[PDB]
């Protein structure tokens, strides 16, 4: 063969914090297919929005939106627990099929995106150049979002454990833990990554006894 | 400047499932410094081994070991709650300093790795060629490890939710969930991504009552 069909730009979805998560890497030979299991961002979330992106930037807002669709009827469960398999499938004709399937409810939804969607060759070159020129600022964005997501998990799971420990947690500890949770929740609302890390570390440092109690419960 | 000091190969650590996780990318200019927070792989683990790797392969075993050290004193917590900060620092002389610090306990341990450690030039070129030739198999291993680690988390969070629900969970459900938990555990020990997925899905299907109970 003298030529191959290949993807000029990465293809993926928007994930928690406004990030583009890639499912098909730039320069993949098509036909190609790829699935990845994702989940909900909140407790008891009953739907997910699949927002399909083309491009090389880390902020989903700086990529090219191809379309979106919702999958409904996800049964009540803690955040991160439902199993939503998302599949990108690009055929020999450059048509992209994107689907989401809830492995538990059996529900599925899908869309079809035309070969002619997304950026033209000029916009493709500009997007590559732009990603290169903002590589630092994109990397800092992605890392603030990861830190925020790790801090959010630490916060809600530490709340969950306070609740389970009940009066087994001594008064002074509950106080120090409440103080640290408040400072942490305030930091997660800012855009200062070192501050979030400082506050997560502070929560870690006053949680020793809470964690011992979780050990006793589940052990 | 007419020359730069650059890493010819990625440098990183072994992580859960036996995979290499990069902390300094291939072709970084030195001096350089990079930190990333990692954690325990099991509930109440009191120590981690930091195993320092050089190379472009996904399986830790296919890379060059540059050495390892332990960090202990880690206080009891659920899996992935302790904050273990791993720093790779290569100074202007090409000496790699690896340390780990437990942000809780404040304990810290390090090792220094000579500039001449690791693969020679011929070996670097074979490493880059082997990584290219096994790109697909390496991706599949990595995906297998990711799925497994996901099932492992599903397994333990489900176990703790059964413990917490206690006698609120009906007898039929305690037994079904436990049977699906054991099946998922057996699958995680294998190397079939799809069979792990089917077992994570079967566990979900019998865990419905558990999820409502958990919600309160």
């Amino acid at each position: 063969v003298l030529l191959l069909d290949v993807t000029p730009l990465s293809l993926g979805i928007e994930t928690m914090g406004g990030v583009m998560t890639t499912l098909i890497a730039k320069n993949t030979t098509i036909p190609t297919k790829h699935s990845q299991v994702f989940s909900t961002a909140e407790d008891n979330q009953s739907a997910v929005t699949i927002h399909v992106l083309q491009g090389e930037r880390k902020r989903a807002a700086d990529n090219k939106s191809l379309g979106q669709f919702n999958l409904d009827g996800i049964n009540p469960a803690p955040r991160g627990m439902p199993q939503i398999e998302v599949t990108f499938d690009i055929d020999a004709d450059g048509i992209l099929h994107v689907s989401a399937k809830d492995k538990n409810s059996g529900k599925e939804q899908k869309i079809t995106i035309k070969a002619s969607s997304g950026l033209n060759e000029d916009e493709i070159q500009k997007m590559v150049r732009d990603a290169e020129a903002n590589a630092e600022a994109d990397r800092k964005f992605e890392e603030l979002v990861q830190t925020r997501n790790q801090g959010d998990h630490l916060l809600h799971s530490t709340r969950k454990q306070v609740e389970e420990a009940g009066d087994k947690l001594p008064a002074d500890d509950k106080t120090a833990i409440e103080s640290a949770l408040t400072a942490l929740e305030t930091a997660l609302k800012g855009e200062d990554k070192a501050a979030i890390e400082a506050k997560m570390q502070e929560l870690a440092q006053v949680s020793q006894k809470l964690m011992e109690i979780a050990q006793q419960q589940h052990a | 400047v007419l020359l730069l000091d650059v890493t010819p190969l990625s440098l990183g650590i072994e992580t859960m499932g036996g995979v290499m996780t990069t902390l300094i990318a291939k072709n970084t200019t030195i001096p350089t410094k990079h930190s990333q927070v990692f954690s325990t792989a099991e509930d109440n683990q009191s120590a981690v081994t930091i195993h320092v790797l050089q190379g472009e392969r996904k399986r830790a075993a296919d890379n060059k070991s540059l050495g390892q050290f332990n960090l202990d004193g880690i206080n009891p917590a659920p899996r992935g709650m302790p904050q273990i900060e791993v720093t790779f620092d290569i100074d202007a002389d090409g000496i790699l300093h690896v340390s780990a610090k437990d942000k809780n306990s404040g304990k810290e341990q390090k090792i220094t790795i000579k500039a001449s450690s690791g693969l020679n030039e011929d070996e670097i070129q074979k490493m880059v060629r082997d990584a290219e030739a096994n790109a697909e198999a390496d991706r599949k291993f990595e995906e297998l490890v990711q799925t497994r680690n996901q099932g492992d988390h599903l397994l333990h969070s489900t176990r703790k939710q059964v413990e917490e629900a206690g006698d609120k969970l009906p007898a039929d459900d305690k037994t079904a969930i436990e049977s699906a938990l054991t099946a998922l555990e057996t699958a995680l020990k294998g190397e079939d991504k799809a069979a792990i997925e089917a077992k994570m899905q079967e566990l979900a299907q019998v865990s419905q009552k558990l999820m409502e109970i958990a919600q309160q």
Partner: peptide, 10 residues
């Protein structure tokens, strides 16, 4: 068997 593995911070 004791665990020494490093996992990801959640």
């Amino acid at each position: 068997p004791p665990q020494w593995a490093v996992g990801h911070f959640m």
